[PDB]
Structures are given as C-alpha cells and as structure tokens.
Amino acid sequence: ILGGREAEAHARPYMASVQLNGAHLCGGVLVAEQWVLSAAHCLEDAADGKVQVLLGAHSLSQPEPSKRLYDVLRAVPHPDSQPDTIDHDLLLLQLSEKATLGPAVRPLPWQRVDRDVAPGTLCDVAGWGIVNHAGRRPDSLQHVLLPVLDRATCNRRTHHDGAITERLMCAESNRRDSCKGDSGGPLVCGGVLEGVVTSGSRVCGNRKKPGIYTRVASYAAWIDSVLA
Structure with missing residues (x-):
C-alpha cells in the first residue's frame, strides 16, 4: 500500500495473507468459515511450492495469540481466467479445515x-x-x-x-x-x-x-x- x-x-478480522513457502505472496479475504477469496494470477506463481493462508495476523513475523497458519485443501481459479488477461481474475481457496472464529478472525x-x-x-x-x-x-x-x-x-x-x-x-x-x-x-x-x-x-x-x-x-x- x-x-x-x-x-x-x-x-x-477478514484479512488474509496468502503465502508461498512461508513468504507472503498476495492478500486475501475470508468470505466463509473454510473459504478465502484472492486473485487468480497469484496462483500462477504459487504453483512453485506449498500454499498456505495466514489468518488473525497483524505482524507477519511476530507471534500473536490470534495467528493461525492454515493449509489449503484446494485452489479453484475462475474457469474463464487466462494468463495474458486481467479478466475474471478471481480464485477461491478451500482451507484444510474450518477457521476457528473469534474477534480477530471473522468472515x-x-x-x-x-x-x-x-x-x-x-x-x-x-x-x-x-x-x-x-x-x-x-x-x-x-x-x-x-x-x-x-x-x-x-x-x-x-x-x-x-x-x-x-x-x-x-x-x-x-x-x-x-x-x-x-x-x-x-x-x-x-x-x-x-x-x-x-x-x-x-x-x-x-x-x-x-x-x-x-x-x-x-x-x-x-x-x-x-x-x-
């Protein structure tokens, strides 16, 4: 920014950090207990490693009681998205389990x-x-x-x-x-x-x-x- x-x-509390191999890659938004919305072209590169979603964070490096790193069950890019265009640039990420909700984590x-x-x-x-x-x-x-x-x-x-x-x-x-x-x-x-x-x-x-x-x-x- x-x-x-x-x-x-x-x-x-809806803010998410989409990470590739432990490093922040793209932002994301928690829209359901087990689903995060992000941009498709973020996955275009995320393909080279393990993708995770950090919820309940303020600081990327310091421990916080609300911080939780979730694995991803599946990634669903919009079917019409293409590598050479900015149209339909949406991606849905399904977390390995429902997010523990609280004051710092909410869709x-x-x-x-x-x-x-x-x-x-x-x-x-x-x-x-x-x-x-x-x-x-x-x-x-x-x-x-x-x-x-x-x-x-x-x-x-x-x-x-x-x-x-x-x-x-x-x-x-x-x-x-x-x-x-x-x-x-x-x-x-x-x-x-x-x-x-x-x-x-x-x-x-x-x-x-x-x-x-x-x-x-x-x-x-x-x-x-x-x-x-």
Missing part, C-alpha cells in the same frame, strides 16, 4: 447486488504489499482510504482506454494506491466487500493510471456454486 498508514491491530459479507458504487465513495483497501517505489515491504498490515472513480472516467484514452469492463471498477490513485503484494486483497465500501485488488504489473500511485479492482457482485453465481 502506497500513501497509507498502519492498520489498527486486528480491526479487519466479511460480500456484495451480491450488481450496482456500481457511487463516484467519490471512500473505500478501504488493506495489505502487506510494498510501501514505496524502492520495493520496501512492511512487517505489519497497512491500509488506505481511496475514492471510487465513475465508470466513464477510467476508460479515458489517457487512462485505461476501454480496458475497464462492467465487471471492473477503479479507484483514484493520486499518491495513494494498492501496489505489488496487495493483489487479491479487499476493497471494502460501507463495511461490505465490493472488490478484490486485480493482479497484473502496473505503476502504483500514478493519478493517470487508476487502480483496478474486480467487482465480486458480477461473480456472485460463480462464488455460490463453488461454496455449495
């Missing part, structure tokens, strides 16, 4: 009504991704409030010329943005999961190139089918 600040410890309700968030609304994004252009990685969870961009504006020639479909949403990126290592994490508006940070190499903090998030409401049918 660029231009943000350290998050209140354990104030976002987050997700958006089912397929309606765009009003332009200007401030949504919260959190992650353990890089905090500056040098590539510095934080030990503790960071977060930043970002205002949502109207659908039309993101598609400008000087921005994401038509790259934004109805299943994608954008948020302002002026000096504050989600960045490398934050992909797969949550974009929460009004206490509900609205988006997931899309994977894909892109500049962070550049106002001409807004951040892109995958709208979960567009995939309500796919999520429902996988969790069934």
Whole structure:
C-alpha cells in the first residue's frame, strides 16, 4: 500500500495473507468459515511450492495469540481466467479445515447486488504489499482510504482506454494506491466487500493510471456454486 498508514491491530478480522513457502505472496479475504477469496494470477506463481493462508495476523513475523497458519485443501481459479488477461481474475481457496472464529478472525459479507458504487465513495483497501517505489515491504498490515472513480472516467484514452469492463471498477490513485503484494486483497465500501485488488504489473500511485479492482457482485453465481 502506497500513501497509507498502519492498520489498527486486528480491526479487519477478514484479512488474509496468502503465502508461498512461508513468504507472503498476495492478500486475501475470508468470505466463509473454510473459504478465502484472492486473485487468480497469484496462483500462477504459487504453483512453485506449498500454499498456505495466514489468518488473525497483524505482524507477519511476530507471534500473536490470534495467528493461525492454515493449509489449503484446494485452489479453484475462475474457469474463464487466462494468463495474458486481467479478466475474471478471481480464485477461491478451500482451507484444510474450518477457521476457528473469534474477534480477530471473522468472515466479511460480500456484495451480491450488481450496482456500481457511487463516484467519490471512500473505500478501504488493506495489505502487506510494498510501501514505496524502492520495493520496501512492511512487517505489519497497512491500509488506505481511496475514492471510487465513475465508470466513464477510467476508460479515458489517457487512462485505461476501454480496458475497464462492467465487471471492473477503479479507484483514484493520486499518491495513494494498492501496489505489488496487495493483489487479491479487499476493497471494502460501507463495511461490505465490493472488490478484490486485480493482479497484473502496473505503476502504483500514478493519478493517470487508476487502480483496478474486480467487482465480486458480477461473480456472485460463480462464488455460490463453488461454496455449495
């Protein structure tokens, strides 16, 4: 996260760290007792090792009573996702067992009504991704409030010329943005999961190139089918 600040410890109990061989790889969101939602392209590389999910954490390195590392039973990428595109960039991870719930570990309700968030609304994004252009990685969870961009504006020639479909949403990126290592994490508006940070190499903090998030409401049918 660029231009943000350290998050209140354990104030976002749904936050997950998707790890590859003990190292943080991508963010994730707990959406059910045994299911974590992340981005598909995170698995593209996760394939080289053992994938685990860390729940109830604030610090990636210090012991915390709420911290729990869970193994993964199965990984279910969206069937239409492709390596060369940012469409359908969702992934569902089934934990080896139901997560022990508590004040520091709790699933987050997700958006089912397929309606765009009003332009200007401030949504919260959190992650353990890089905090500056040098590539510095934080030990503790960071977060930043970002205002949502109207659908039309993101598609400008000087921005994401038509790259934004109805299943994608954008948020302002002026000096504050989600960045490398934050992909797969949550974009929460009004206490509900609205988006997931899309994977894909892109500049962070550049106002001409807004951040892109995958709208979960567009995939309500796919999520429902996988969790069934």
